[PDB]
Design an enzyme around this catalytic site. Structure first.
Site, PDB file in Angstrom:
ATOM      1  N   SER A 208     -11.902  -5.742  -1.860  1.00  0.00           N
ATOM      2  CA  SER A 208     -10.844  -6.069  -0.906  1.00  0.00           C
ATOM      3  C   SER A 208     -11.322  -5.874   0.525  1.00  0.00           C
ATOM      4  CB  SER A 208      -9.632  -5.158  -1.122  1.00  0.00           C
ATOM      5  OG  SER A 208      -9.247  -5.069  -2.472  1.00  0.00           O
TER       6      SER A 208
ATOM      7  N   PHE B 127      -3.397   6.995   4.396  1.00  0.00           N
ATOM      8  CA  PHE B 127      -2.382   8.045   4.353  1.00  0.00           C
ATOM      9  C   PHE B 127      -1.894   8.271   2.929  1.00  0.00           C
ATOM     10  CE2 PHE B 127       0.744  10.475   6.889  1.00  0.00           C
ATOM     11  CZ  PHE B 127       1.759  10.664   5.967  1.00  0.00           C
TER      12      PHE B 127
ATOM     13  N   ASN C 223      -6.505  -9.743  -4.298  1.00  0.00           N
ATOM     14  CA  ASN C 223      -7.387  -8.700  -4.816  1.00  0.00           C
ATOM     15  C   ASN C 223      -6.747  -7.319  -4.677  1.00  0.00           C
ATOM     16  OD1 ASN C 223     -10.005  -6.737  -4.276  1.00  0.00           O
ATOM     17  ND2 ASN C 223     -10.378  -8.305  -5.842  1.00  0.00           N
TER      18      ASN C 223
ATOM     19  N   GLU D 226       7.800   6.558   3.767  1.00  0.00           N
ATOM     20  CA  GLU D 226       7.774   7.898   3.190  1.00  0.00           C
ATOM     21  C   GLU D 226       9.119   8.604   3.227  1.00  0.00           C
ATOM     22  OE1 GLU D 226       5.209   9.238   1.658  1.00  0.00           O
ATOM     23  OE2 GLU D 226       3.671   7.777   2.242  1.00  0.00           O
TER      24      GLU D 226
ATOM     25  N   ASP E 277       6.500  13.971  -5.125  1.00  0.00           N
ATOM     26  CA  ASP E 277       6.206  12.571  -4.839  1.00  0.00           C
ATOM     27  C   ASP E 277       6.244  11.751  -6.130  1.00  0.00           C
ATOM     28  OD1 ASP E 277       3.712  12.860  -6.080  1.00  0.00           O
ATOM     29  OD2 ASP E 277       2.553  12.549  -4.250  1.00  0.00           O
TER      30      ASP E 277
ATOM     31  N   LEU F  16       1.530  15.974   1.546  1.00  0.00           N
ATOM     32  CA  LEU F  16       1.139  16.590   0.282  1.00  0.00           C
ATOM     33  C   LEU F  16       0.819  18.069   0.491  1.00  0.00           C
ATOM     34  CD1 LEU F  16       0.269  16.391  -2.745  1.00  0.00           C
ATOM     35  CD2 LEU F  16      -2.024  15.832  -1.896  1.00  0.00           C
TER      36      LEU F  16
END
Ligand SMILES: [Cl-]
EC number: 3.2.1.17
Length: 162
Positions: free
Chosen positions: A117, A104, A132, A11, A20, A32
């Site tokens: 998955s 996250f 996948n 990040e 972002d 965010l």
């Protein structure tokens, strides 16, 4: 390596409001603020989150406290979710970090589409899960991030981050 170092690598750190990859107002280590296009709405969310009049800028200490809260919230969200918790509890510690990383980035709702998955991960079919996971908007929009996380699920090592 641990989850905090992994997400700090993915990040980065910025002390002023930024956008972002999707165009949303964000600050700190990927926190965010809002999906609204209004910078004023983002500034209000920031002041509420920090507890002072920031005018769009925070300190490093404030960024690190927000980050700790955000990682804790991701973990709690996994543990409260009847679909995610059994898969999480089946994973070793390194792969658990990859799971937190996805939550996250995309939230519980973003990871809802990964049902197939999740089943492969619970069955420890690592190569099949990796293929996948890559068949996703996630992989196509943030491929380098996705490749690091997928490699962590595939190998159970930190090699993608070293
Ligand atoms: Cl990327």
């Amino acid at each position: 390596m641990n989850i905090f170092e992994m997400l700090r690598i993915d990040e980065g750190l910025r002390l002023k409001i930024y956008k972002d990859t999707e165009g949303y107002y964000t600050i700190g280590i990927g926190h965010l603020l809002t999906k609204s296009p209004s910078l004023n709405a983002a500034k209000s969310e920031l002041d509420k989150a920090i507890g002072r009049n920031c005018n769009g800028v925070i300190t490093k200490d404030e960024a690190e406290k927000l980050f700790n809260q955000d990682v804790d919230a991701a973990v709690r969200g996994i543990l409260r979710n009847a679909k995610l918790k059994p898969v999480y509890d089946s994973l070793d510690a390194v792969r658990r970090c990859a799971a937190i990383n996805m939550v996250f980035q995309m939230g519980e709702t973003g990871v809802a589409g990964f049902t197939n998955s999740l089943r492969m991960l619970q069955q420890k079919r690592w190569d099949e899960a990796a293929v996948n996971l890559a068949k996703s908007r996630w992989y196509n929009q943030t491929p380098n991030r996705a490749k690091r996380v997928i490699t962590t699920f595939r190998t159970g090592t930190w090699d993608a981050y070293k």
